[PDB]
Amino acid sequence: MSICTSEEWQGLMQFTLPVRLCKEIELFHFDIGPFENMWPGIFVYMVHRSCGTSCFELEKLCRFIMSVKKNYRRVPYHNWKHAVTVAHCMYAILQNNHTLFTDLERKGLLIACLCHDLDHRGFSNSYLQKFDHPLAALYSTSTMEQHHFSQTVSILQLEGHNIFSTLSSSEYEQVLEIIRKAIIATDLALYFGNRKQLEEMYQTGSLNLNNQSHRDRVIGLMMTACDLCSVTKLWPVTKLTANDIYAEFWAEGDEMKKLGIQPIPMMDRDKKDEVPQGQLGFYNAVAIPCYTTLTQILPPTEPLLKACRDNLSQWEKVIRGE
Numbered sequence: 001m002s003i004c005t006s007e008e009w010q011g012l013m014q015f016t017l018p019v020r021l022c023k024e025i026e027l028f029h030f031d032i033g034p035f036e037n038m039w040p041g042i043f044v045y046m047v048h049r050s051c052g053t054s055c056f057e058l059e060k061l062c063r064f065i066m067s068v069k070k071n072y073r074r075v076p077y078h079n080w081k082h083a084v085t086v087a088h089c090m091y092a093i094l095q096n097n098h099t100l101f102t103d104l105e106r107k108g109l110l111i112a113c114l115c116h117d118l119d120h121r122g123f124s125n126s127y128l129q130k131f132d133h134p135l136a137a138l139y140s141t142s143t144m145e146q147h148h149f150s151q152t153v154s155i156l157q158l159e160g161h162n163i164f165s166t167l168s169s170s171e172y173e174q175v176l177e178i179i180r181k182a183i184i185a186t187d188l189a190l191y192f193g194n195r196k197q198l199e200e201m202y203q204t205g206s207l208n209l210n211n212q213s214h215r216d217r218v219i220g221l222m223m224t225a226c227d228l229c230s231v232t233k234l235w236p237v238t239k240l241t242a243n244d245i246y247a248e249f250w251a252e253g254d255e256m257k258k259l260g261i262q263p264i265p266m267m268d269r270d271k272k273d274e275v276p277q278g279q280l281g282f283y284n285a286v287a288i289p290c291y292t293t294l295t296q297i298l299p300p301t302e303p304l305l306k307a308c309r310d311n312l313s314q315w316e317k318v319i320r321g322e
């Protein structure tokens with residue numbers, strides 16, 4: 001696939017985060033947006049503050065991050081910026097609930113977050129399946145998500161990027177499986193089922209964090225909550241992020257129009273007027289339920305739901321002309 005230069009990872013090793021960001025990075029609403037140059041360095045900081053300064057060989061970690069950066073395409077939304085936004089939200093989740101998770105879970109989850117959309121071409125699973133893309137022949141279900149995990153393993157299996165080699169054989173297999181489940185849970189189709197099972201478990205009082213299956217379900221919803229966190233930022237950031245998401249949807253719809261196929265309104269560039277209504281529906285059907293369930297299981301996660309509710313109110317104000 002694609003490897004980083006020696007210049008790149010060496011510069012990353014030298015990086016020190018400014019003290020004003022130290023405070024701000026702990027906050028859920030933190031926008032990485034204005035600090036592009038610092039993004040690989042922000043990740044290292046997060047790994048170190050969550051797992052410790054010596055739980056990963058600095059050299060190997062820097063080569064990994066830099067190769068991960070390289071294997072993210074320059075698509076409008078599913079890019080390197082998205083990888084770091086998702087990893088930051090996970091960092092904020094882990095920090096506010098530190099001892100609920102194991103050291104192996106904290107490790108794998110931050111890496112799974114940075115790799116979850118690895119080598120995204122800007123096309124949905126529906127597209128790949130309907131136009132019989134080689135990737136759909138390889139992976140029948142959760143097409144992109146199984147490919148993103150394949151890329152993650154392939155970056156690990158690269159010369160001096162294998163950040164986990166120093167773990168036990170038992171521990172290496174576990175973390176690689178935590179990562180597999182985490183990246184697969186990021187397939188939004190799987191979320192709806194998972195969210196309903198967790199909601200029942202919470203209501204009946206049967207949710208037990210010591211139960212592996214229950215644990216894997218909670219991690220899954222954390223993955224979805226991190227993947228959607230752009231809906232959790234200040235209204236001007238959230239509004240701009242939706243422009244990138246729709247730029248990608250419209251580009252996919254344009255490829256269907258070129259084949260004579262009419263795209264769904266969401267992927268139609270001619271149907272922009274329907275976007276505020278589409279966002280309201282997504283917040284009501286997907287985002288609000290996700291953050292609601294996450295707050296019930298993990299009460300410290302509450303500011304995510306609070307900001308989501310604020311952005312929903314903003315979309316209502318766009319619909320009602322305010």
Ligand SMILES: COc1cc(F)cc2c1nnc1c2c(-c2ccncc2C)nn1C
Nearest residue numbers: 186188227228229230231245266278279282
């Ligand atoms: C009608 O609006 C939407 C429809 C939709 F299907 C997905 C999304 C969406 N609106 N905001 C979103 C979506 C996503 C997302 C999540 C996981 N995989 C792919 C994407 C694009 N992230 N964010 C912040």
Ligand SMILES: [Mg+2]
Nearest residue numbers: 116117186187
């Ligand atoms: Mg994805």
Ligand SMILES: [Zn+2]
Nearest residue numbers: 082116117227
């Ligand atoms: Zn994603």
